[PDB]
From a paper:
[name] is a non-receptor type protein tyrosine phosphatase ([name]) that contains five domains ([name], V, central proline-rich, [name] and second proline-rich domain). Thus far, two [name] components have been found to interact with the [name] domain of [name]: the [name]-0 protein signal-transducing adaptor molecule 2 ([name]) and the [name]-III protein charged multivesicular body protein 4B (CHMP4B).
To verify the direct binding between the two proteins, we prepared the recombinant [name] [name] domain containing residues 1–361 (referred to as [name](1–361)) and the [name] core region containing residues 260–370 (referred to as [name](260–370)). Similar to that of Alix or Brox, the [name] domain of [name] adopts a boomerang-like fold containing a concave binding pocket, where the C-terminal tail of CHMP4 may be accommodated. We noticed that in our [name](1–361) structure, these residues (together with neighboring residues Arg205, Ala336, and Leu338) form hydrophilic and hydrophobic contacts with Asn33 and Tyr34 from an adjacent [name] monomer, suggesting that the crystal packing interaction between [name] molecules will prevent [name](350–370) from being accommodated in [name](1–361). Nevertheless, together with a slight conformational change of α1-α2 loop, a remarkable difference in the arrangement of the [name] molecules was shown in the two crystal forms, which allows [name](350–370) to be accommodated in [name](1–361;NAYA) and the complex structure to be determined.
Author numbering: 1 to 360
């Protein structure tokens, strides 16, 4: 299982930005309230504008993440000095395209701009994580960190922006995103633990956790309101995710099988391999029409499980003659969480650089 072909990963698209004309409001505030010249601060507003234009047309690569967090940070620094929140004096319309329906959604609130940049940070992390092939030592560790970063960004949005500015950032949908990301992160670690050939029982528990994350995500997908918004996207995700639910349940029981054979419980060895074979077969049925990357993972895994089941059932029928216990009676595999939504510090000076609006 060290060498199993990698499953493909889900990633989210970035939102499309409308206009955020903050400079006339900033200047009209600093003349009216401090009593200064408008044009006294035109380099620190112009730098912000070049920073925003760069963020909303962000390069789809690792450097692009730092670009988004600098702008996220600079946006906070501005709000700390100029009141551009909902209902406040210098508030200007912020417009963004809601990613699933394509509708323009506008809010006279700077936190809306912050929220969308945060979303795109999460989406971009999901992209970087999913394009890697996860074969090298360096792809597996970084993909996992990217997916945790994605989860962390969406989780931060869920907590600090409870007002759903638009339905693509509603709480149940951000929850879906978080669980999807943690699932893919956990999946990366499972692949790593199988490469490192960790204790069979530990691998089983890790795989069981992959199942728990994907199940939560799958639950969210069977929600009518979520299903209607996502549209086709719901059907693509669900078909991959539902398939993976049975696949990693099979991987989990494969390793419960290997543990059983390590402990000389050779009747239970057969039970776990049989169970793994049935669950894998359901996965294969659910995987019809899916790309060859999926099919190659499943057929590699079937030769592993198929071979061990045959070996296990046979030495048991001729040598050990122990009864094959019903799964019911055997202790359930509990998931082992190894991943967490990595917290975002928007105003970390190491990522924001000097405050553009230091003078103010």
């Amino acid at each position: 299982m060290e060498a199993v072909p990698r499953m493909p990963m889900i990633w989210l698209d970035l939102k499309e930005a409308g206009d955020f004309h903050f400079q006339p409001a900033v200047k009209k505030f600093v003349l009216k309230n401090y009593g200064e010249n408008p044009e006294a601060y035109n380099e620190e507003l112009k730098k912000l504008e070049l920073l925003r234009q760069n963020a909303v047309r962000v390069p789809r690569d690792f450097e692009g993440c730092s670009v988004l967090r600098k702008y996220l940070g600079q946006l906070h620094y501005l709000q700390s000095r100029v009141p551009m929140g909902s209902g406040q004096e210098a508030a200007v319309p912020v417009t963004w395209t809601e990613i699933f329906s394509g509708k323009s959604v506008a809010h006279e609130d700077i936190k809306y701009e912050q929220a969308c940049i945060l979303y795109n940070l999460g989406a971009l992390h999901s992209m970087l994580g999913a394009m890697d092939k996860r074969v090298s030592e360096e792809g597996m560790k970084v993909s996992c960190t990217h997916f945790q970063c994605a989860a962390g960004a969406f989780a931060y949005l869920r907590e600090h922006f409870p007002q759903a500015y638009s339905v693509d950032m509603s709480r149940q949908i951000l929850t879906l995103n978080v669980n999807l990301m943690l699932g893919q992160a956990q999946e990366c670690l499972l692949e790593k633990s199988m490469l490192d050939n960790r204790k069979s029982f530990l691998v089983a528990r890790i795989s069981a956790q992959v199942v728990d994350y994907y199940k939560e995500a799958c639950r969210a997908l069977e929600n009518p309101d979520t299903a209607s918004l996502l549209g086709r996207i719901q059907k693509d995700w669900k078909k991959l995710v539902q398939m993976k639910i049975y696949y990693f349940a099979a991987v989990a029981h494969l390793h419960m099988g290997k543990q059983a054979e390590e402990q000389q419980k050779f009747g239970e060895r057969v039970a776990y391999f049989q169970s793994a074979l049935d669950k894998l077969n359901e996965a294969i049925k659910l995987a019809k029409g899916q790309p060859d990357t999926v099919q190659d993972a499943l057929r590699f895994t079937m030769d592993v499980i198929g071979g061990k089941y045959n070996s296990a059932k046979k030495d048991n029928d001729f040598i050990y003659h122990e009864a094959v216990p019903a799964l019911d009676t055997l202790q359930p595999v509990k998931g082992a969480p190894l991943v967490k939504p990595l917290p975002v510090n928007p105003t970390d000076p190491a990522v924001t650089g000097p405050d553009i609006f230091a003078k103010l």
